[PDB]
Design a protein around this nucleic acid. Structure first.
Lengths: 274, 44
RNA sequence: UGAUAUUGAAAUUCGGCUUUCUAACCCGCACCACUUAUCGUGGUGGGAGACAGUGUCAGGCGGGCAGUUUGA
RNA sequence: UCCUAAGGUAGCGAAAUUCCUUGUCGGGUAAGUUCCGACCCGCACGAAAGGCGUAACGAUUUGGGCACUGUCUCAACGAGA
RNA sequence: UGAGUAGCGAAAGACGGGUGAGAAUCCCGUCCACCGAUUGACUAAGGUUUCCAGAGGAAGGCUCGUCCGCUCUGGGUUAGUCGGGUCCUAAGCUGAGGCCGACAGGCGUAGGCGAUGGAUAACAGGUUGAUAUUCCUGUACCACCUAUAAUCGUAUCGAUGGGGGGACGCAGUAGGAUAGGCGAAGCGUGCGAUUGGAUUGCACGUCUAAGCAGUAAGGCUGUCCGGUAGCUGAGCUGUGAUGGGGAGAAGACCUUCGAGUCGUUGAUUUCACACUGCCGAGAAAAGCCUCUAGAUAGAAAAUAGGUGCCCGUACCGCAAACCGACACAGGUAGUCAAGAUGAGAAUUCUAAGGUGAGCGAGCGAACUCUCGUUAAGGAACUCGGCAAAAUGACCCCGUAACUUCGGGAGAAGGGGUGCUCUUUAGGGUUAACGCCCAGAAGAGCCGCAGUGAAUAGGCCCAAGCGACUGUUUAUCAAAAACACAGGUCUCUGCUAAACCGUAAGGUGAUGUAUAGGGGCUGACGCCUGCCCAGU
RNA sequence: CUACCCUUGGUCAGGUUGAAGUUCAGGUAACACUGAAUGGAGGACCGAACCGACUUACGUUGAAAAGUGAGCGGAUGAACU
């Protein structure tokens, strides 16, 4: 399922694309459509704060529900659709009530799924179930952190995580990065692994192809001036010169740790990433 | 060769207009300095 | 990073190191209301909890930025 | 034998690096301080401030041929401002 | 003073007749020349009376001036439909109450403002010294008001609420139609020079909206509304609109009047994001339809009249009136786009329509500049083949090392090219006749020269650097410098790291380790060894 | 004016080359090799408008405080407006 081009011209030579064999319907849904104007990494003050953003192709936002909260209703998948916002594909499900919404499509799923509560249905792919009713060693994705907020972890393409032993109030989950942490047992989770596994094997090929995705060129700090980057500039090509490489804002960026986000969560993080 | 001044009625009234200077406190001081000196036109 | 105020109640153990509890404080967590919006306020539930956040004082790091010296 | 924390490996070499130097020997010219091929005696090449190669591509930099001509031997005449 | 010195800002003018004190320069006439994918015709911005008529010649115009975009005195912009508002919303701006902050103030919800977009009823002619979808003629449409009829009455009106629609990317053919174009003979007025012609040579060969039908092709098929297991739209054509308007011209003299409107052919870059393909996956809201909450009482058939506001409208608009101190070889979005010659909006000569460039007359020196040719040699020039010359279009023949198999390649190196006649199956278009685009061969004529003019690669053998397309010091450096696809290291469990303010509030991201920020290296191929004392 | 970005529009005479795929005859237990027609991909090719500024001449009390001639580069895209 990987399309490979022939070296007809330069640039197109060592290119690689996807096959899009899993997509069923090309036209999206009109009800679940929202505008999404570009920001180009500019703040609410109008100043650039994140570099290398700007340009790209026009896009629209497709409303995806991550709560997955229904009282025993059956839904049959209709089609797998393309999403320019994420790396994974999405699926349009239709409940028995007559309601349609978009969910993240797991790997190998076209059969009907049920938004189930505890022991409502079997452990099958695409079923939303709390972490208390999932046996040890079952791989899951799109799990919640705080009850009712929605799924946050393991949403990229080909991402998943399994469930280790329980401790009454919390369960043990080994994440995709190798990190081990405790998660509250009243949070939902979807059984299975998400598809689009061949998304990372793609070769962009030319510079213009990365331009219309929203990426601007990157200039090295070694070819700047001494007032622009700590790596400055000397006569000819020069090495780093400093005892340690530096960020454009004057902070060491090779090895130093920056763990200051949340201090309450160190109680729940058991082992670091691998 | 292209010059540096291109006339425009809307851009001249939306930046140097009377209502533009009466919306900020520092612009309210500009109309006061021109009244003290005695200029003919205040905002242009 | 420590001392102290906001800041409480219990039980181990040589005035303190600990482990629990809930009532302060906190929640870019759901629900209900003003409200034809959830920015905000107030309720009902969960999580967290005397920690975090904040004020005063003290030590360390700090060409990221600033003021200046580099003799006849 | 002395010494350090270890003593330059694969490659490449009078190089966009070689001061001594127009190094020495071939090839190209009737005549070549530049150019190409080797030699290694690397003042002071060297493996991601990457080493050695490589089709296609270049208003890029060098060496040599074929056409072609007032560039030049060596200038003369005519038209317009 | 320099000095009666430089200059007088790309370009073809000549003569006759007028005006007047005064004319190479103003007016009229004729001939000649220039542009013509534009030096022509419409418009947005911008300028703000430069527009028109009768008078003036002090200053301004690089000369002159009786003339003027200059001076003086009077004049000239007409809208229910064309553009903007009484309609809708993008980015952005602003923001009641709120959150934050030494002050000033900052941020932000509901709600507003805001087109370069979406919606929205009018088209042909006539007319002035200056206005025209605006005035006047001819035929229409639209919102509303009142008065009379078919017919009533569970008929009727529905929201700011629900739902459907509005509704959107790029490339690529094929097909229907139409505008304009060309040819033969509609009708009209000429029919003769300088040698022969009377089968002569010129010029015409139209007519819109609205409403009556039928039409290439395209989509789609069976809260009572929306969801769950022939029904719309559509270029064009025909009839009427039109016993009217326009019209090459003629007979007499806003005077009267009466004149043709056919068929053939080749055809768009205009009329369908329609239709297939592709990945980078392509605003929003209102009008418009429908459903019930709520209002318990009309005409959506028709007749007849009546009503309909505010702003812009002159003139220049690739230019002497706009931005450049100037009447300045510069710069300025969009639309219309003829003939012969051609793939063509290239090239040459012309049409509609414009213009002759605001100092001239002589002479035909040195020198400088833009152009043409040149005997015998052919890079001997020079730091360097710098600058010139040469190569150049179309149909044929033929084509190397090397290679990532795509290429190299238009490799190199060669041949053919006009005119006349004869013979001759073929493309399309019509019942044919005809019209349009073409191909073989053969026999001859002409010149020094046949793509006879303009338009249009020089090539080849090697080496260095960067893989490539791309970007850079506006105004002395375009490169080996930057970027790039790829590789690698390191940080980041989500109120993420990072950044701005280092406050509220944001970007990252309406994302979640196949993700995001930072350092280094730079396609591809083969590889990347030794050292942890020190920092 | 210029640099980057945001929202909404517009512009690109004319030719050439012929990737994927489909179809089809052959070929095979079968997958799929070959030929034929079809297809119309690309920071592809030649070249006007448009946008740039590589070499040279003229100009340098210039027509112009950055220009004009003769050639030249890109020209469906990381394009121009």
């Amino acid at each position: 399922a990987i399309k490979k081009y022939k070296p007809i011209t330069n640039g197109r030579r060592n290119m690689t694309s996807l096959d899009f064999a899993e997509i069923t319907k090309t036209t999206p849904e009109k009800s679940l459509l929202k505008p999404l104007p570009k920001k180009a990494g500019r703040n609410n003050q109008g100043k650039l704060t994140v570099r290398h953003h700007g340009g790209g192709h026009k896009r629209q936002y497709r409303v995806i529900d991550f709560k997955r909260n229904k009282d025993g209703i059956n839904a049959k998948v209709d089609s797998i659709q393309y999403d320019p916002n994420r790396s994974a594909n999405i699926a349009l499900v239709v409940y028995a009530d007559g309601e349609k919404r978009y969910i993240i499509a797991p790997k190998g799923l076209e059969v009907g799924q049920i938004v189930e509560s505890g022991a409502e249905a079997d452990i099958k792919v695409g079923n939303a179930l709390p972490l208390q009713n999932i046996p040890v060693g079952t791989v899951v994705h799109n799990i919640e952190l705080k009850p009712g907020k929605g799924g946050q972890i393991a949403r990229s393409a080909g991402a998943s995580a399994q469930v280790l032993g329980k401790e009454g109030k919390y369960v043990l989950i080994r994440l995709r990065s190798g990190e081990v942490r405790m998660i509250l047992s009243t949070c939902r989770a979807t059984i299975g692994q998400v598809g689009n596994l061949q998304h990372e094997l793609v070769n962009v090929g030319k510079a213009g192809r990365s331009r219309w995705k929203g990426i601007r060129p990157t200039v090295r700090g070694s070819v700047m001036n001494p007032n622009d980057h700590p790596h400055g500039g000397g006569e000819g090509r020069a090495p780093i010169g400093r005892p340690s490489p530096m960020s454009p804002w004057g902070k060491p960026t090779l090895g130093k740790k920056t763990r200051r986000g949340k201090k309450s969560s160190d109680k729940l993080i058991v082992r670091g990433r691998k | 060769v292209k010059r540096t001044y291109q006339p425009n009625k809307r851009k001249h009234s939306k930046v140097h207009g009377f209502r533009k200077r009466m919306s900020t406190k520092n612009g309210r001081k500009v109309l006061a300095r021109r009244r003290r000196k005695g200029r003919k036109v205040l905002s242009a």
